[PDB]
């Protein structure tokens, strides 16, 4: 069937045009992240020679700075873990001193079969809030003083070799430019190159039909 190969045709060489395209799509994409790259570098290395016993006295710091950051977020699960530990227990002895109102009097009569069903599950309830309450209020202990011993390392390497810290700071913010660059342009390229491997991928699988299609219209020759 000759209609039945030339439409076929046809897309693969459409194919081989776009991907001709997307290739050079990355090809720009990829040297300007080579020039950007190189060029951040030589700023970054002329600011070393500036600054450069500083920064590494400075490091100290902002490595305990990022612990900051991390001891931080310890105790941001300790109090919220606690927060909800001591919400639990007041909405279960809500639960319960409801129902110990009516259960001081047992008078209720179509209200105390109503009750007790209530109060049961509540009083099953603060059996495992007050186990999950003690552990929370304990883990919110632990966190909290490496919280401030964090702070209180920071606060006394901030108080020493300020200098270090004080002629550093243009260095990590030049790095903190380009860095946000960089990782920007990362993205742009392995999504192009994602891209591409679908397109690269989409032309190997037109050309197993041809394969197949060859294999195909060859059932036909034999009749």
Same mark, same amino acid.
């Given at each position: 069937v000759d209609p039945r190969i030339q439409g076929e045709l046809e897309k693969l060489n459409q194919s081989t045009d776009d991907i001709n395209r997307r290739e050079t799509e990355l090809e720009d994409a990829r040297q300007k992240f080579r020039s950007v790259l190189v060029e951040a570098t030589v700023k970054l290395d002329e600011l070393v020679k500036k600054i450069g016993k500083a920064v590494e006295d400075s490091k100290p710091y902002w490595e305990a700075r990022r612990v900051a950051r991390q001891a931080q977020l310890e105790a941001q699960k300790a109090t919220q873990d606690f927060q909800r530990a001591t919400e639990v227990l007041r909405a279960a002895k809500e639960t319960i001193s409801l129902a110990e109102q009516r259960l001081l009097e047992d008078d209720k009569r179509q209200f105390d079969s109503a009750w007790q069903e209530?109060?049961?599950?509540?009083?099953q309830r603060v059996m495992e809030a007050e186990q999950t309450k003690t552990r929370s209020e304990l883990v919110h202990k632990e966190? #909290?003083?490496? @919280?401030?011993?964090?702070?209180?390392?920071?606060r006394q390497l901030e108080k020493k070799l300020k200098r270090a810290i004080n002629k550093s700071k243009?260095?990590?913010?030049?790095? #903190?430019?380009? @860095?946000?660059?960089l990782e920007q342009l990362?993205?742009?390229?392995?999504?192009?190159?994602a891209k591409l491997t679908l397109a690269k991928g989409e032309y190997k699988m037109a050309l197993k039909n041809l394969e197949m299609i060859s294999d195909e219209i060859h059932e036909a020759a034999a009749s």
């Amino acid at each position: 069937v000759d209609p039945r190969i030339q439409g076929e045709l046809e897309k693969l060489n459409q194919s081989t045009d776009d991907i001709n395209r997307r290739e050079t799509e990355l090809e720009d994409a990829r040297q300007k992240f080579r020039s950007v790259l190189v060029e951040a570098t030589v700023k970054l290395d002329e600011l070393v020679k500036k600054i450069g016993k500083a920064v590494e006295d400075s490091k100290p710091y902002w490595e305990a700075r990022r612990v900051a950051r991390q001891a931080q977020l310890e105790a941001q699960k300790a109090t919220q873990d606690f927060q909800r530990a001591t919400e639990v227990l007041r909405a279960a002895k809500e639960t319960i001193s409801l129902a110990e109102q009516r259960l001081l009097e047992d008078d209720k009569r179509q209200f105390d079969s109503a009750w007790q069903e209530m109060l049961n599950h509540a009083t099953q309830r603060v059996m495992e809030a007050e186990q999950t309450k003690t552990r929370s209020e304990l883990v919110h202990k632990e966190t #909290a003083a490496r @919280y401030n011993a964090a702070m209180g390392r920071m606060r006394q390497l901030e108080k020493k070799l300020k200098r270090a810290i004080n002629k550093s700071k243009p260095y990590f913010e030049l790095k #903190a430019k380009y @860095y946000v660059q960089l990782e920007q342009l990362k993205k742009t390229v392995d999504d192009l190159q994602a891209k591409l491997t679908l397109a690269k991928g989409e032309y190997k699988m037109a050309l197993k039909n041809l394969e197949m299609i060859s294999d195909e219209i060859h059932e036909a020759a034999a009749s």
